[PDB]
């Protein structure tokens, strides 16, 4: 016996309504830009063909990697760069990113549905 089933009020019921066999609808999206995947290298998943994009990093990928790296260091992640006073995750990440010392694979995505893996090491970051 357990009166716990009547001792609740507002059970966080994750309403699960079955709905399999629905339509796809390719127009059910809002993105159309280069949505890139930020993955941590070491597993290094890459394709087996010549890449079509450019081995350069703009302020888009830079800021994305930087934000993710600051999040890492902010969690007490080891620094891959030299410290000349940089005691903040952003400063260190900026140094690492500028030196391509940040271990992260950036998978680019095109509006056609294609995707290409791009490591920071393979990208020339133009500050």
């Amino acid at each position: 016996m357990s009166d716990n089933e009547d001792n609740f009020d507002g059970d966080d019921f994750d309403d699960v309504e079955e709905d399999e066999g629905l339509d796809d609808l390719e127009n059910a999206e809002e993105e159309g830009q280069e949505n890139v995947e930020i993955l941590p290298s070491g597993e290094r998943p890459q394709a087996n063909q010549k890449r079509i994009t450019t081995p350069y990093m703009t302020k888009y990928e830079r800021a994305r990697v930087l934000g993710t790296r600051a999040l890492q260091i902010a969690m007490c992640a080891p620094v891959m760069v030299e410290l000349e006073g940089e005691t903040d995750p952003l400063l260190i990440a900026m140094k690492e990113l500028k030196a391509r010392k940040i271990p992260i694979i950036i998978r680019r995505y095109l509006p056609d549905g294609s995707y290409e893996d791009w490591g920071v090491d393979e990208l020339i970051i133009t500050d």
Partner: protein, 108 residues
């Protein structure tokens, strides 16, 4: 397995129903729950009669499967297996949910 009344596909142990400690058994045509130590399921709902299945996930110390029936009725099955209580919910969910269309209107 456990064909004591019907063919049970999913056997969910440590399940309670409104102060009743027992076990949940998903049979081919119906979800039947019985009390631990009883040879008979004191609850048996055909997937047809089950209008919708609602289920409370992690966050609460009580994982529950509420079978909301057509009339507005319901069946509160509390997954109380401290080991996989929530994981039970998910399996009973994915399965029962797939069991529903089997008892729902077809393409016509």
């Amino acid at each position: 397995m456990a064909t004591s009344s019907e063919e049970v596909l999913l056997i969910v142990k440590k399940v309670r129903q409104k102060k009743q400690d027992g076990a949940l058994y998903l049979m081919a045509e119906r979800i039947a729950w019985a009390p631990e130590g009883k040879d008979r399921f004191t609850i048996s709902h055909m997937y047809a009669d089950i209008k919708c299945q609602k289920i409370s996930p992690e966050g609460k110390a009580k994982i529950q499967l509420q079978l909301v029936l057509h009339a507005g009725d319901t069946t509160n099955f509390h997954f109380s297996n401290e080991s996989t209580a929530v994981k039970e919910r998910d399996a009973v969910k994915d399965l029962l949910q797939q069991l529903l269309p089997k008892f729902k209107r077809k393409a016509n």
